[PDB]
């Protein structure tokens, strides 16, 4: 009996990806899900996870390599590795030099999800939906307060977004930038923010309960697709704003103690087949990292520039740098202060 243990994000695979793999290979898959890097990180820190494959962000993977959590990938067992986009490989290699440990899976941005009709009702037909001004300018957010504003409960993404918007380094290593200007702006916005939460905004966008959110692109597009399938009249869109936004990459990696390594490599090379990961993107509305797969992605996903952004949009994106623990600690205390008001 061949077995394979996978730990992935929620809502991050097609319904039949596992079933098809089982039919093709005869391998029994045990598939478990998490919905935060914090849950994932806690299990990787405790070790003896029992997983053969896990899906960290490339950022988190960088933090764990020095701990020896992962083992290097034998690329000779991944003959379709050549299908991966070399530019995505280079971006992930900022966290994983020479792409030793991780296989790029999916990637997206942190932008603005919004209710088209409710935003235009409050701010007019020319509402600045192409700009972080839509939610980071206090006069705008005061007007959208009534239809509901959510921010991620994610200081790393929110502070980097605020710093970029203010003209600071999105990855500032200077503590005063977090405690001074970034906190000042967030404190001014905070009375207009209904909640800080990194998943309630998906259903709330889809049902019309909130009209603007900071959110992950594909999760906002899932909300939009849910509203369309429900025929409830709700029109959700997503903006990568003109000032730029954070891009991030989720990757497959193999825990150092993984028992089912041959099965794990079969699954990784299965994901490298163009139709497999194209079908996942079709269902979860995230861009995958496989350049061979792109033409196979449905046109409604492939041609969506908030999922597959073109060159002028990608040039404005920034990626997260790992900070000294001193900055981590400053961010955490400042975030506490912001949420409490
Ligand atoms: Cl990342």
Author numbering: 29 to 369
From the manuscript:
To gain insight into the evolution and designability of ligand binding and specificity, we analyzed the homologous PBPs, PotF and PotD, which are Escherichia coli putrescine (PUT)-binding protein and spermidine (SPD)-binding protein, respectively. Still, the protein-binding modes differ: PotF shows affinity for PUT and SPD, whereas PotD exclusively binds SPD. Prior to this work, we grafted the seven differences in amino acids from PotD binding pocket onto PotF; this resulted in PotF_SPD, which will be referred to as PotF/D throughout this work to keep naming for mutants more concise.
Unfortunately, we were not able to crystallize F88A after numerous attempts, while high-resolution structures for both other variants were acquired. To counteract the aforementioned difficulties, we constructed a variant bearing F88L instead of F88A. It acts as a substitute to evaluate whether the structural positioning of Y87 can be altered by removing F88. We obtained high-resolution datasets for this variant in a similar fashion as for the other constructs. To our surprise, all solved structures adopt a PotF/D-like semiclosed conformation. The same behavior is observed in the F88L variant where Leu tries to mimic Phe positioning. In F88L, Y87 remains flipped outside the distal region of the binding pocket.
